[PDB]
Amino acid sequence: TSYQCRVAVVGAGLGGLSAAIGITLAGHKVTILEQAPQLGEVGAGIQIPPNSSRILRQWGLLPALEEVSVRPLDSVLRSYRDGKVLSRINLVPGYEERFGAPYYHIHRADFHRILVDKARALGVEILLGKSVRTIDFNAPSLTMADGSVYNDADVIIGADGLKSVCREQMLGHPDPPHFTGDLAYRIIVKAEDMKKHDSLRELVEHPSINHWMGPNSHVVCYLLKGGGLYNIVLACPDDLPELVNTAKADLKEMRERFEGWDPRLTLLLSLVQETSKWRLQNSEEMDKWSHESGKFVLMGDACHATLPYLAQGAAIAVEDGAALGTLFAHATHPSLVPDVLTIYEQIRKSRTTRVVRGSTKQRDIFHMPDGPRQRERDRQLLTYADNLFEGYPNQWADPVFQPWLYGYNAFEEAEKAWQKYLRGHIFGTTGAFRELGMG
Length: 439
Ligand SMILES: Cc1cc2nc3c(=O)[nH]c(=O)nc-3n(C[C@H](O)[C@H](O)[C@H](O)COP(=O)(O)OP(=O)(O)OC[C@H]3O[C@@H](n4cnc5c(N)ncnc54)[C@H](O)[C@@H]3O)c2cc1C
What we know:
Keywords: FAD, Flavoprotein, Monooxygenase, Nucleotide-binding, Oxidoreductase. Helices cover 37% and strands 21% of the residues.
C-alpha cells in the first residue's frame, strides 16, 4: 500500500494537463478543476520546440502529434520593408540532430485534445464547471462560485493561467495582469489561394517560421496542417481605442499597419478567411510560487507569464509539469511533499526567469525602429551569421542561449536537484528526508 497524494490541479490548460500527466505517471491521483463548462477546442497555432517535444515523446505522444503537426524547415528573421532575409536558422534536420527532438507547429486545439486524451487514459478526473474563488491553504480546500467546497485533496497546484485566482488568493491581495500596451491581429489564409500568386509560393513549398521585424511591430507567419491554413499574427501598438472588431475593421486596420511592409504581407490581407483582434497582456514575475503551509504551488503563466516573442510559454509549462511529476515520483512519504514543492520552484524559477528575460530581449530586437540602431542590428545579423557570438541579435541563434533553451531536459534537472536535496544541499527545505532515513 504505497503513498498516494491527492493532488488537485486548478485549470485544464496545457500546463495543468502536463502536471496531471507527470504526477499520475508518478503514482498519485490527480483531479483537474477547470472553470469553462467544456474543454477548449479553441485557439490558433502553437510551437512545440525540442525541450517540450522530448518530454511529450517520453509520454508516448509523438505519433498522435505528428499526425496533426508540421515540421518547419527553418526559422527566418526578415526586414519589414523588403522581406529581406537577415537571419536563417536550420531546424530540419538541424534541431533533431543537435537536441534530439522534433520542433512542431500544431494547432492549439489539437495539442490540447491530445493532452486531455492522454490524461483521461491515465485516469485523471476532470471536473468542469468548477470556478474557484477562495482557497484555504492549510486544510486544503477549494471553494467554488456556486458555494460548493472541494476538500478531497492533499495538495493544490495552481494552473489557472494569466487571470489566476490562485495567485491572488495565495498573495492575499488582488493582482490583475499588466497590459503590454500592444495588440495582436490573427489572420488565417488558405494555402491553396497562396499557391495561386507567384510571390507567395515559396512560403508554401518551403514551410518555415517567417518573422518580419519592424518599427514597434512584428509579423509571424507559419503553416498548420488543418485546412492547409496559414497563420499570420501581427503584433503592433494599440495607439487606437475603438476595439471595433468586425471582419472589415481589421482589413482596413491591418492594411494601414502594413503601410510600407513587404508587399507580400499586404497581398495576404486580400486572401483572408478569418480575422481576430485582441489586446495583449501578461504578469510580472513572482518571488514566491509556494505558500508557507507547504500545500500549494503555482505553475505556468500564473507564476512565470512570458512575452510571446520566444515561443516558449507552453514549452516551459510542459517543463513545469514534467518537473512536478519527476519530483512527486520521489514523494513516497507525505512529509516529503512540501520539500518537493520547494525543490521545484527553485529549479523552475531559475529557468523560467531566464526565459522571461530572453523574450523581453527578443522584443527589443524585433521592435527596433528604423535608424542607426536598426542599421547596426541588421549589420550584425548578416555579418556574423557564420561566426556567431554571445549577444547575437537573434536569441534563437545565440550560441549560448540556444543550446541552453533547447537542450534542457526537465527530467534530468529535477533528478539532479533531488540528489542535491538528499545530500542536504537545497536551501529552504524542512529536511523531511532526514527523519525518513534517506541520506
Ligand atoms: C499570442 C500568443 C502566442 C503564443 N505562442 C506560443 C508558441 O508558439 N509556443 C509556446 O510554447 N507558447 C506559446 N504561447 C504561450 C502559451 O499560449 C501559454 O504559455 C499556455 O497557455 C500556458 O498554459 P497554462 O496551463 O500555463 O495556462 P492556460 O493555458 O491559460 O490555462 C488556464 C486555464 O485555467 C482556467 N482558469 C482560469 N481561471 C480559473 C479559475 N479561477 N478557476 C478555474 N480554472 C480557471 C482557464 O479557463 C484555462 O482553461 C503563446 C501565447 C500567446 C498569447
